[PDB]
Amino acid sequence: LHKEPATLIKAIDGDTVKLMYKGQPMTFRALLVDTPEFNEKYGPEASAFTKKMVENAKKIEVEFDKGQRTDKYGRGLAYIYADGKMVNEALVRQGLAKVAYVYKGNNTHEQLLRKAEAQAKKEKLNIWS
């Protein structure tokens, strides 16, 4: 896989963000995770966590996996990086997302994110408390 440049347009919630990619606005949905919706427990915290991560970043990148790059809602499906740190992994490590939506061919970082979930769980963090 390889990282490509993108620019923040707007935070949306824990696992979606609006980014300018190859000069076009698109909503990106974070691969391999699921944050609570804003109306659910930890949802506001998930939203706040991702917002700080992307808004503070001097550099956002997106990394597509090997399979589909758009979901059925027209959202980009990627791993999203903020100054080199993967949002997807960071959410999971903080117990603010579960590993989820693991589809064949788009699962390159599955074991990485699983390892993070295991540690969040060990630490009884947030969703796991």
Ligand SMILES: Cc1cn([C@H]2C[C@H](OP(=O)(O)O)[C@@H](COP(=O)(O)O)O2)c(=O)[nH]c1=O
């Ligand atoms: C993360 C992801 C979600 N989706 C689809 C599955 C779910 O369809 P359904 O909407 O029909 O339940 C939806 C969940 O995304 P959200 O968790 O943002 O709601 O997005 C994909 O198709 N591929 C993906 O990689």
Ligand SMILES: [Ca+2]
């Ligand atoms: Ca969600």
